[PDB]
Paper text:
Most importantly, the C2 carboxylate participated in hydrogen bonding with R244, R234, T235 and both S130 conformations. Although the C2 tail occupies roughly the same location in both the wt SHV-1 and K234R SHV structures, it appears as though the tail is slightly disordered in the active site of the latter structure as evidenced by its weaker density. The R234 residue also adopts two conformations, as in the apo K234R SHV structure. In addition, we also observed two conformations for residue S130 with 35/65% occupancy. The residues with increased temperature factors are predominantly located in the Ω-loop which encompasses residues 164–179.
Bacteria harboring β-lactamase enzymes [E.C. 3.5.2.6] pose a significant threat to public health. Sulbactam, tazobactam and clavulanic acid are mechanism-based inactivators as they share similarities with the β-lactam structure, the normal substrate for β-lactamases. Similar to a substrate, these inhibitors can, after acylation at catalytic residue S70, undergo several inhibitory reaction pathways including fragmentation in the active site and covalently cross-linking at S130.
Numbering used by the authors: 26 to 238, 240 to 252, 254 to 292
The structure:
């Protein structure tokens, strides 16, 4: 592989789209690679990690319990609800909803949780409270994935998203147990986790949440590192490319390969 930045550039040339990327040490926040890190990108389903961070904050404050069962109706469901469709009769716990949102990208689960934190405005207020003044949620699932050009709704920047994920996982803003829970949800991703492991060299840790949207929007927020450690946050977004889903996946994987091959920086 070329160096990471050279590969990121190559991916833009090949996609005819914008890539936004940051590689950050999880423990310290050291930024190693940054490319369009201050430009806006649609979050897509990656917002689900911040959503569950807001849920966990409520749990820590005693205003929520992960055990609490929510009993929803079919009229409450949106597109792609693989877990939530199964539990119309018996409901799902708040924690089960988080797991379905993060590990399966269950959209109805994300919307039920969104309501509990005061909707998109409530989540945005949470982000401002942890000092993210850039990331914003404006819409519910599934409309938040629309990715219109020039539209600032439902966007983050690589730098903001990385800093916010670090705050949630490590800053002791969340309780120790809640930090551990958010991490485990990302470790348990079923959408991309097992596939990524299948192509990672032995010894490499992965945890992740992915997203996809219109106009080629694609993204991943991930923890990655050798020696089976979550050494770094890697955030990659793509926007405004006409490329196939397969090609977008391959280009992100190629950036990952360049990181792996040239890890010691
Ligand atoms: O010298 C480093 C390594 O080089 C190769 O590993 C390859 C691997 O065989 C390939 O499957 C992967 O593709 C990249 C797959 C990455 C998957 C997505 C990564 C995510 C992770 C977090 C966010 C960014 C994207 O590249 C690495 C590095 O060349 C060798 O196979 C391996 O034995 C060796 O230890
Ligand atoms: C979040 O990123 C959602 C992506 N698109 C979904 C949506 O708009 O609700 C779809 C329903 C596709 O969803 C999936 O394939 C699940 C995995 C999405 C992910 O990467 O997390 S839409 O039909 O594209």
């Amino acid at each position: 592989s070329p160096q990471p930045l050279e590969q990121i550039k190559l991916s833009e040339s090949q996609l005819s789209g914008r890539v936004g990327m940051i590689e950050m040490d999880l423990a310290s926040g050291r930024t190693l690679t940054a490319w369009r890190a201050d430009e806006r990108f649609p979050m897509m389903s990656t917002f689900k990690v911040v959503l569950c961070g807001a849920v966990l904050a409520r749990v820590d404050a005693g205003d929520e319990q992960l055990e609490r069962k929510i009993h929803y109706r079919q009229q409450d469901l949106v597109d792609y609800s693989p877990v939530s469709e199964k539990h119309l009769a018996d409901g799902m716990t708040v924690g089960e909803l988080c797991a379905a949102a993060i590990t399966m990208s269950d959209n109805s689960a994300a919307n039920l949780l969104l309501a509990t934190v005061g909707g998109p405005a409530g989540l945005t207020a949470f982000l401002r409270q942890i000092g993210d003044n850039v990331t914003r949620l404006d819409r519910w699932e599934t409309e938040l994935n629309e990715a219109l050009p020039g539209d600032a709704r439902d966007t983050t920047t690589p730098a903001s998203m990385a800093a916010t994920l670090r705050k949630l996982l490590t800053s002791q803003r969340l309780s120790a147990r809640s930090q551990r829970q958010l991490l485990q949800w990302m470790v348990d991703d079923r959408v991309a986790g097992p596939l990524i492991r299948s192509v990672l060299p032995a010894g490499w840790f992965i945890a992740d949440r992915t997203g996809a949207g219109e106009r080629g929007a694609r993204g991943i927020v991930a923890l990655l590192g050798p020696n089976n450690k979550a050494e770094r946050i890697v955030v990659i977004y793509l926007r405004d490319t006409p490329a196939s889903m397969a090609e977008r996946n391959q280009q992100i994987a190629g950036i990952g390969a360049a990181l792996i091959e040239h890890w010691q920086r």
